[PDB]
Design a protein around this ligand. Structure first.
Ligand SMILES: [Mg+2]
Ligand SMILES: [Zn+2]
Lengths: 158, 83, 1111, 104, 142, 94, 263
RNA sequence: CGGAGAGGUA
DNA sequence: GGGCTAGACGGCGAATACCC
DNA sequence: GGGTATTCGCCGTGTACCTCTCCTAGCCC
């Protein structure tokens, strides 16, 4: 068992899905500028389209692994339950997905690159938001969990 | 009546547990006025006093078990029959 | 070896001096060298002009100067002094009535000086002042949280320089002003400031519906004097509303330029936001006995305009980096100096009434005590003055660039929520989004960017290249965030032909929002990706393939590397290693062209072109603050010709000017018999055989001799009841000789102290009678080596009483210090890590013959677990490993900058080149493919890694181009059933070593009050059995174990004594008793007039004190 | 016996005066020079007990043969020094004062 | 821990408290919901529950909304915000303590309406829902 | 795991009763210097040191093995404590 | 009132509070002895009341009384009783213990499920009294005092004492703990095996229960003394007898990354 | 061998 | 020179605030 | 007089370990 940079296999369907998503986004923009749907509906449909593209590319990644590389190390590590979940495998092989602003709103453009292909400085700075958010979340959750545990212990100690 | 875990813990009858928990001054004043008597029922009180907690091997259900072999038991039985 | 470098982005500017943030700030603050006649109104001069002149005889200030340091730096480090300079001030006292002029230069204490690197020496220790981030003063407008359509107008002066003024539009219509938790209608103060009903009506009339809430006839009736009286009654209830008190209070609250000080940055922010011109740094002025407005009317206008929805009025984000500023060491020192000077001024005012009112000389008036007290307080006890972290030069270089949001006038750990911890959109290019402490301090502590510099006002600026038309110019502009939000900024990696943008559509930013833009709308462009990250993060190659959560740990762990005696620069560098070593000032560089005249392990003598013969002494085997050994090594030879800027001496953890914190090792990625389980690491013994990862550490012990009322303590070779073997290594003066090896228990310094008068117990009287030995009047207080330590003694420092030049603490005759060194090899328990965040402890050290080896016979050194990659998502290490394999087989090093580096096809080409060398060599010596290689090739073609039909050589090449080679098992000899990734990785040895952490205790000291065992490894204490451990033991239902943990191994005194005796006698332990802490609790409760009574089952009292407390 | 209950109740001035072995009347704590305890201070040896086991302050009785005895010279009882951890003092206020716990 | 009848004398309260508290650090509503549930705090956006049985009758003003629970002898009126989502269609019989609006139920009102057993069951289920959503297996016993 | 821990848990109604029985038997064995055992010389617990096989000094192991044999009788209120101690010290002096 | 090793005095704030109270009480007695006007006696009695309040509970009312030249409020009796640093939660529900140790952990794949690798030095320090007894039994030392004076120094240790130590720990167990202890399986009983080095060798399968990884974690060792504690540990707390989690009932000691991968 | 402040590890 | 003296956030319960 | 409604003061917010520094100031005999 080993891990090489070529063990993260990029499927061919990713390019077709991205081109389809680009033409769909162009159609959405053209339909918006004609006054058919407002800004809220445009934002919502963009998010919907990108989520559908993400799930599609995940399915494609896993079908490719299952069909052409049944013994690929990442696929084996995911299937056997030893390490990793489908989302991290997608982030390695597929596309990074959508990142959200610090206020909670989701960015309009997604991170179309993967760690296997390498990001750009802008996308990295974008994902740093969610990274710091999760870190602070854990750091502030630990103390509340401890306090709850102590309260419960002291209420049912007898 | 329904009350949260905090109030339910603070309103207990044993004043040592409530004193060690939270709001020490309030519980201590109320207990001192009421002249309360802690019966050492829970585990925290017995831990504070450094006694044997009433759980596990300290439980009153098994704490008094005796062990004796056949020979000594037979000898004691003979000694009691001749008494 | 050859150095190959990739990348196409050409940077137009080099990095600024990495430590300018401290050095330039302090140099501006002091103004030491500039002639006094031309000093600007900043820093010390500003504080002097602010405090002086004090009326009450009128004392006036003219100028100041700084003397010479009494002792050089190393001397202060030696004798625990503060490296400081004396500050003199030429003051003249003028008698207002007659005209007496008494001018003289008074000594006002000392000021600590900054070293050449940017750190201070306080009491012999190296210290660093950390810059602090906070909210910029000025005027802000925020949305009202509860009432939606309303706004809050805040006016905030400098910290501790005035109160926070709040303005709100109440629901009933009246405008309420809040100061110091006191709310009142703003109309009263508006009347006080000289405003009339007609004036407000004509000014604010554009927005009617709020003017009616502003109109109040009751206050318009009374003159500003009665309004001021009523206002003072509203602010200070209970105080007699005498007119002078009200005037003085309101003046000191608003119009006093000494008590209320809006910032220069604050005044600039106000002029920019409100679009007005401020004559001074106060809200209002006390002129002609009345008050005159400066700020309140325009900000009220702006608020009433905004609340109505006029275009052009926007709320302000309190996290926008145009609203937050940085205080450098200069500003903090100036603030503390101003506080001390104000105390000195009020003291002088006190002395101007007592004493002889005629015979007064400024030497008699001023007392230097408060200024020295304040400055020493700041430099010693302040929350920002931190112990320097100098494990390696990079560590101190990072510490000098750290930015904290805590400290005086800052957030606390409890009041820090999610908002202050987040990454705002304006940190791009100013604050590193990656590097931050992990844990509770996350997000509160950060690091400056690479190209970021701090201007005179305190805002962080970043450079951008100007883009006019479609051509990218070369002149850079340093911009702040407020100015940055007005343009469209392209990215750094856009395609370029010459100076023209070659791409039809570029990726740009507008107010932090990413967008696609046509070239003609591009106004600015980035300089380089380096400007987005800090200095630590800029050293991690292939960063574009690593998750942020792991690059964080990598950046943090690079700081904790230990300087090895055989350090090596990495095989894959980012091109920033030389600048870090040059700016850390660890190394020694040639000043000008010339020739080396003398080179020795102690000093280097250089002859320059000028003819002057310069001599640089090399700091050799010096102990850092953390215990590591810093030393310089000469890298030239006699007769060598050197130019300007060439390397002369190699600093600690550096290899020919390149930063070298670790070593390059041949690592293979595979699981190995469970020894890699969960981040563990297997290493070869070859690393220990050739002295890899060997580091030197220095421990320092200190003992004092002091005067005791029973007689003075003495240091002497004569100690009672010691065999000569224990005194073999001591000299005549009781100190160990330099070079003697010391082990746990041995004596470092012999010291005798007069025996305290005590009656010998009749048992001891019997022993003394039967043995016939007299007890000595002195007893052994010698310093001994603590358990687990030891090594070689290298230096002994001795400072007595009555010896010239040194001073000690009162009561101490002499003090002796001993330095002990030891070479720490790698062993089971030490911590290793690479730059991409992979860390782990060494779990097994195998012999050389058991390690997997390449077919040509070379064995790998380290074995990593592949199961760490997929969940951590740090693929940078795999690419670094491929490139390291290519380099190891080609014999060269590579430089791949961040986000513009070696892509995959170039690595494939390099790997093909390396495979040629690796295979054609074996082919020439008369060897084909091995049988085991053929079997592995078959098994690999069954896996789809190679193409079927090709010859074994072509399949081996196809495997090599993916970074995989065939390995053999050192134990069995058969090959691994599949190809395995192998390559060179750069691994550093961290500072947390098992030798410093292992600890055990059977019995030892106990505390006085609670009679429980002490804590910490230093005092030979025991571990803490916390509350949760008690919960666990209860859940197991183990009652006797818990009872023993609470009494026998604890503060039950007679219980534990009887337990020890019974154990050494062979019986079972006795039954415990009530702990001593419960008795302490009972007595404490009795101290509060509360009777606590223990009772039996029949409610009768039970004495737990055994009549000791019963009369 | 065996501890089975723990009762807590208010303490009358009578029980307080019964707990104490003497009144503290001088704010001094210890002689700064000799390091001996000040007379009638917060650390007095006649009130709270001896410092060294089985030894009076003036040095008249220094053995376990004398226990419970009170030295006439120094006024100290000769017992184990551990009693310095248990015995309590009392201050006699000139005017009554309200316990803050039962007020605020 | 042994898959057999529990032994007399086991400390069950501590085990229950630990089994509930240990997986807390994995809950990304979540932990605040669990906390407000264990403290029986009145929720902020609380639903409305029918105190009495009867048939539902909606009355909708263009600016106001109301629900009428109509029995044979009794009638009860509840005023609701305009945007409050409804979980009952007109002409339906609802039990006492049945939620009308979407949201969290105030435990004290449920106790006054439906009695203790309903509150205990509701609390158990609502606390279990969070650990279920977070993929944490935990017995209802604790 | 311990030898025959399953049969040990089968013998009692509560694991804590088994723990108490084992502890008390071990204390008895320690007090009476192992010469009051119920085991046979061939099944005594053995310990392998550098010299050879010897008697295991751990009393708890002896107690668990003895309980596994089945020649022990344990329960509540079998005999007053003082009478038990007197008869035990009389049969096996110290 | 402790004279620190440096010769300086460290005084509990109780001493300062008592000094202030006795000062004001003597002042009030002296004023009452002379019969001052009502205002002086009044403000003196007010100061006495405030001093008593500060002694019993400082900071409860008004500004907290502090030392001259400091802002730190003095520590009254109430502040000593309550709080996380107070007497209850610090010295009563949790204590420091003897016969304990702490070190770094390292995976050992060769150990059984009920074993743990323990360094020789930590074992020699923890089991010191039993080692002295065993050394007195055999001919290694004449008495326990000579044995202690023999063991006090490291360069005086011969090899027979290692065989004696191996004889001592035969069958005994030690408790391993890792903070934070979230559930009852954070403390587990293991049989020690004397190994070289300075790190604690741990079994792989128990890593999930402790939630411990090998990126530098540390663990604490405790030793139960008497036969009762030894039985309680060997029967109920042994790691080989706790295979199912009390929370859900599903196994905890189950295969993991490398094992599952290989299988 | 008591308390504060700072940094760090898990 | 030493000794002496002077930029959260929630809940919880009582106290008004206020309205009928 | 009563039945809410607000608000104002108090208490509370993880465990374990390691390193270092620093613990009053002024005046007069
Ligand atoms: Mg870890
Ligand atoms: Zn005497």
């Amino acid at each position: 068992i080993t891990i090489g940079i070529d063990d993260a296999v990029i499927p061919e369907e990713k390019k077709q899905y991205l081109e389809e998503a680009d033409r769909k986004l162009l159609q959405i923009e053209q339909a918006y500028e004609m006054g058919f749907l407002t800004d809220r509906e445009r934002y919502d449909q963009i998010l919907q389209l990108w989520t559908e593209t993400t799930e599609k590319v995940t399915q494609a990644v896993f079908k490719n692994f299952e069909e052409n590389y049944p013994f690929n190390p990442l696929y084996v590590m995911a299937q056997s339950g030893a390490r990793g979940n489908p989302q991290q495998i997608r982030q390695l092989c597929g596309l990074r997905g959508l990142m959200q602003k610090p206020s909670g709103e989701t960015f309009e453009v997604p991170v179309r690159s993967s760690f296997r292909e390498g990001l750009t400085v802008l996308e990295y700075f974008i994902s740093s938001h969610g990274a710091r958010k999760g870190g602070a979340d854990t750091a502030l959750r630990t103390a509340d969990s401890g306090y709850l545990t102590r309260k419960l212990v002291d209420v049912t100690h007898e | 009546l329904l009350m949260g875990v905090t109030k339910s813990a603070l309103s207990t009858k044993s004043w040592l547990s409530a004193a060690s928990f939270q709001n020490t001054t309030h519980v201590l004043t109320e207990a001192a006025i009421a002249g309360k008597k802690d019966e050492l029922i829970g585990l925290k009180e017995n831990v504070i006093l450094g006694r044997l907690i009433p759980a596990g091997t300290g439980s009153d259900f098994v704490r008094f078990t005796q062990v004796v072999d056949q020979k000594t038991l037979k000898a004691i039985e003979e000694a009691r029959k001749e008494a | 070896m050859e150095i190959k470098r990739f990348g196409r982005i050409r940077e137009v500017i080099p990095l600024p001096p990495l430590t300018e943030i401290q050095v330039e700030s302090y140099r501006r603050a002091l103004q030491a060298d500039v002639p006094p006649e031309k000093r600007e109104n900043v820093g010390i001069q500003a504080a002097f002009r602010e405090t002086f002149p004090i009326e009450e005889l009128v004392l006036d200030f003219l100028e100041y100067r700084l003397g010479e340091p009494p002792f050089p730096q190393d001397e202060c480090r030696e004798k625990d002094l503060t490296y400081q300079a004396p500050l003199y001030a030429r003051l003249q006292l003028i008698h207002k009535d007659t005209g007496l002029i008494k001018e003289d230069e008074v000594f006002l204490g000392h000021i600590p000086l900054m070293t050449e690197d940017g750190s201070f020496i306080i009491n012999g220790a190296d210290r660093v002042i950390v810059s602090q981030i906070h909210r910029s003063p000025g005027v802000y407008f925020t949305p009202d949280p509860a009432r939606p359509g309303r706004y809050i107008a805040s006016i905030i002066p400098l910290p501790k320089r005035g109160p926070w003024i709040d303005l709100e539009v109440e629901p009933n219509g009246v405008v309420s002003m809040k100061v110091n938790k006191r709310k009142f209608p703003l109309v009263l103060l508006l009347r006080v400031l000289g405003y009339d009903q007609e004036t407000l009506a004509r000014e604010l009339g554009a927005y009617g519906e709020l003017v009616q809430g502003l109109m109040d006839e009751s206050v318009f009736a009374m003159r500003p004097e009665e309004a001021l009286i009523r206002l003072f009654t509203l602010l200070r209830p209970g105080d007699p509303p005498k007119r002078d008190k009200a005037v003085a209070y309101v003046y000191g609250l608003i119009a006093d330029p000494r008590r209320y000080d809006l910032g220069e940055a604050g005044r600039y922010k106000a002029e920019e936001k409100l679009g007005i011109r401020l004559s001074g740094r106060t809200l209002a002025r006390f002129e002609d006995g009345e008050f005159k407005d400066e700020v309140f009317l325009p900000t009220l206008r702006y608020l009433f305009a905004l609340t109505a929805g006029v275009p052009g009025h926007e709320v302000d984000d309190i996290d926008h980096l145009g609203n937050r500023r940085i205080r450098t060491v200069g500003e903090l020192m100036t603030d503390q100096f101003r506080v001390g000077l104000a105390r000195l001024a009020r003291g002088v005012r006190e002395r101007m009434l007592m004493g002889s009112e005629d015979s007064l000389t400024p030497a008699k008036l001023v007392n230097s005590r408060p200024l020295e007290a304040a400055i020493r307080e700041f430099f010693s006890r302040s929350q920002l003055s931190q112990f320097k972290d100098e494990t390696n030069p990079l560590s101190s270089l990072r510490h000098k660039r750290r930015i904290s949001a805590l400290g005086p006038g800052g957030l606390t750990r409890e009041r820090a929520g999610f908002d202050v911890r987040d990454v705002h959109r304006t940190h791009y290019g100013r604050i590193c989004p990656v590097e931050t402490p992990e844990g509770a301090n996350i997000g509160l502590i950060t690091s400056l960017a690479a190209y970021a510099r701090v201007d005179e006002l305190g805002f962080i600026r970043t450079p951008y290249r100007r883009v006019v038309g479609g051509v990218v110019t070369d002149e850079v502009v340093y911009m702040t965030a407020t100015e940055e939000d007005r343009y469209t900024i392209a990215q750094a990696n856009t395609p370029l032909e010459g100076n023209r943008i070659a791409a039809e559509r570029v990726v740009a930013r507008r107010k932090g929002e990413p967008v696609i833009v046509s070239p003609e709308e591009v106004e600015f462009m980035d300089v380089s990706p380096k400007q987005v990250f800090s200095v630590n993060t800029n050293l991690i190659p292939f960063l574009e393939h690593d998750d942020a959560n792991r690059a964080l740990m990598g950046s943090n762990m690079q700081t904790q590397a230990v300087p090895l005696i055989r350090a090596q620069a990495p095989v894959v560098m980012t091109g920033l290693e030389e600048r870090v070593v040059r700016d850390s000032l660890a190394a020694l560089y040639a000043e000008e062209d010339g020739e080396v005249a003398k080179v020795d392990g102690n000093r280097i003598v250089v002859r320059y072109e000028d003819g002057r013969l310069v001599e640089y002494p090399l700091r050799r085997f010096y102990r850092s603050n953390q215990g590591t050994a810093l030393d310089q090594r000469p890298r030239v030879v006699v007769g060598q010709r050197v130019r300007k800027g060439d390397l002369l001496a190699d600093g600690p953890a550096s290899e020919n000017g390149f930063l070298a914190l670790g070593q390059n090792v041949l690592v293979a990625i595979m699981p190995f018999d469970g020894y890699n389980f969960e981040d563990a690491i297997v290493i070869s013994e070859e690393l220990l055989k050739r002295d890899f990862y060997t580091s030197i550490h220095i421990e320092r012990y200190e003992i004092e001799a002091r005067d005791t009322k029973l007689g003075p303590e003495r240091i002497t070779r004569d100690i009672p009841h010691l065999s000569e073997a224990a005194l073999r290594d001591l000299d005549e003066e009781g100190v160990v000789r330099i070079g003697a090896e010391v082990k746990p228990g041995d004596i470092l310094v012999g010291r005798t102290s007069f025996k305290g008068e005590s009656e010998p117990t009749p048992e001891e009287r019997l022993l003394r009678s039967i043995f016939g030995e007299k007890a000595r009047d002195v007893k052994d207080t010698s310093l001994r080596v603590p358990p687990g330590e030891g090594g070689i003694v290298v230096r002994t420092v001795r400072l007595r009483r009555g010896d010239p030049g040194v001073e000690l603490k009162p009561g101490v005759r002499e003090v002796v210090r001993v330095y002990v060194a030891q070479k720490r090899k790698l062993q089971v328990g030490d911590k290793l890590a690479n730059r991409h965040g992979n860390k782990g402890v060494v779990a097994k050290i195998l012999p050389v013959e058991d390690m997997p080896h390449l077919p040509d016979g070379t064995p790998v050194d380290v074995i990593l677990n592949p199961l760490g990659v997929p969940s951590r998502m740090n693929l940078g290490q795999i690419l670094e490993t491929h490139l390291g394999l290519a380099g190891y087989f080609l014999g060269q090093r590579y430089i791949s900058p961040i986000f513009d580096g070696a892509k995959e096809p170039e690595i494939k080409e390099l790997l093909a080149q390396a495979f040629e060398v690796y295979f054609g060599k074996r082919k020439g010596e008369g060897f084909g493919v091995d049988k085991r290689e053929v079997e592995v090739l078959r098994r690999a073609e069954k896996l789809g890694l190679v193409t079927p039909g090709k010859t074994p050589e072509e399949q081996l090449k196809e495997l090599f181009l993916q970074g995989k080679v065939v390995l053999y098992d050192g134990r069995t000899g058969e090959p691994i059933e599949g190809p395995i990734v192998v390559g060179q990785m750069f691994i550093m040895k961290l500072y947390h070593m098992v030798e410093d952490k292992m600890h055990a205790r059977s019995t030892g000291p106990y505390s006085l009050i609670t009679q429980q065992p002490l804590g910490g490894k230093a005092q030979f204490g025991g571990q803490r059995f916390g509350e949760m451990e008690v919960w666990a033991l209860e859940a197991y239902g183990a009652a006797h174990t818990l009872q023993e943990m609470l009494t026998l191994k604890s503060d039950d005194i007679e219980g534990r004594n009887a337990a020890y005796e019974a154990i050494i006698k062979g019986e079972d332990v006795p039954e415990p008793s009530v702990p001593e802490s419960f008795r302490v609790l009972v007595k404490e409760l009795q101290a509060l007039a509360l009777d606590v009574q223990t009772l039996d089952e029949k409610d009768n009292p039970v004495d737990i004190f055994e009549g000791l407390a019963s009369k | 016996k065996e501890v089975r209950k723990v009762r807590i109740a208010l303490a009358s001035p009578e029980k307080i005066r019964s707990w104490s072995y003497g009144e503290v009347e001088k704010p001094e704590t210890i002689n700064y020079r000799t390091l001996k305890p000040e007379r009638d201070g917060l650390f007095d040896e006649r009130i709270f007990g001896p410092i060294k086991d089985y030894e009076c302050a003036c040095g008249k009785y220094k053995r376990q043969r004398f226990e419970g005895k009170v030295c006439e010279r120094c006024g100290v009882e000769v017992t184990k020094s551990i009693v310095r951890r248990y015995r309590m003092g009392h201050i006699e206020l000139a005017t009554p004062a309200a316990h803050i716990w039962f007020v605020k | 821990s042994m898959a057999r009848p529990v032994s007399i004398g086991e400390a069950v309260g501590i085990v229950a408290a630990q089994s509930i508290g240990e997986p807390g650090t994995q809950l990304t509503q979540g932990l605040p919901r669990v906390i407000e549930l264990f403290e029986a705090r009145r929720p902020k956006a609380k639903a409305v529950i029918s105190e009495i049985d009867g048939v539902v009758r909606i009355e909708e003003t263009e600016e106001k909304l109301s629900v009428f629970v109509e029995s044979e002898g009794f009638s009860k009126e509840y005023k609701l915000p305009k945007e409050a989502r409804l979980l009952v269609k007109d002409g339906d019989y609802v039990e006492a303590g049945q939620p009308l609006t979407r949201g969290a139920i105030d435990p004290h009102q449920l106790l006054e309406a439906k009695g203790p057993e309903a509150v205990e069951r509701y609390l158990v289920e609502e606390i279990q829902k969070v650990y279920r959503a977070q993929g944490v297996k935990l017995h209802d016993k604790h | 795991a311990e030898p025959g821990i399953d049969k040990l848990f089968g013998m009692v109604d509560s694991k804590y009763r088994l723990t108490v029985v084992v502890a008390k038997r071990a204390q008895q064995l320690l007090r009476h210097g192992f010469k009051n055992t119920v085991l046979e010389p061939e099944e005594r617990p053995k310990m392998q040191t550098l010299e050879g096989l010897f008697d295991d000094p751990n009393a708890v192991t002896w107690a668990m093995k003895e309980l596994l044999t089945g020649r022990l009788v344990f329960g509540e209120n079998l005999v007053p404590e003082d009478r038990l101690q007197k008869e035990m010290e009389r049969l096996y002096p110290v | 009132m402790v004279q620190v090793d440096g010769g300086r005095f460290a005084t509990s704030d109780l001493n300062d509070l008592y000094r202030r109270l006795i000062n004001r009480n003597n002042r009030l007695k002296k004023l009452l002895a002379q019969g001052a006007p009502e205002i002086i006696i009044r403000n003196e009695k007010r100061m006495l009341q405030e001093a008593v309040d500060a002694l019993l509970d400082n900071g409860r009312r008004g500004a907290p009384v502090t030392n001259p030249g400091s802002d730190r409020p003095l520590r009254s009796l109430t502040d000593i009783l309550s709080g996380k640093q107070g007497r209850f939660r610090q010295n009563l529900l949790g204590k420091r213990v003897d016969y304990s140790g702490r070190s770094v952990i390292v995976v050992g794949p060769q150990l059984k499920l009920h074993q743990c690798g323990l360094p020789k030095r930590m074992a020699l320090e923890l089991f010191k009294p039993f080692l002295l007894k065993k050394m007195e039994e055999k001919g290694i030392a004449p008495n326990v005092k000579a044995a202690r004076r023999m063991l006090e120094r490291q360069r005086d240790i011969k090899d027979e004492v290692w065989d004696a130590l191996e004889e001592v720990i035969h069958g005994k167990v030690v408790l391993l703990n890792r903070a934070p202890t979230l559930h009852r399986l954070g403390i587990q009983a293991f049989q020690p095996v004397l190994v070289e080095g300075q790190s604690i060798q741990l079994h792989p399968l128990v890593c999930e229960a402790f939630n411990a990884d090998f990126d530098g974690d540390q663990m604490a060792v405790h030793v139960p003394l008497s036969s009762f504690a030894q039985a309680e540990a060997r029967i109920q707390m042994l790691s080989a007898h706790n295979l199912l989690s009390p929370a859900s009932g599903e196994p905890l000691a189950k295969p993991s990354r490398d094992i599952i991968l290989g299988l």
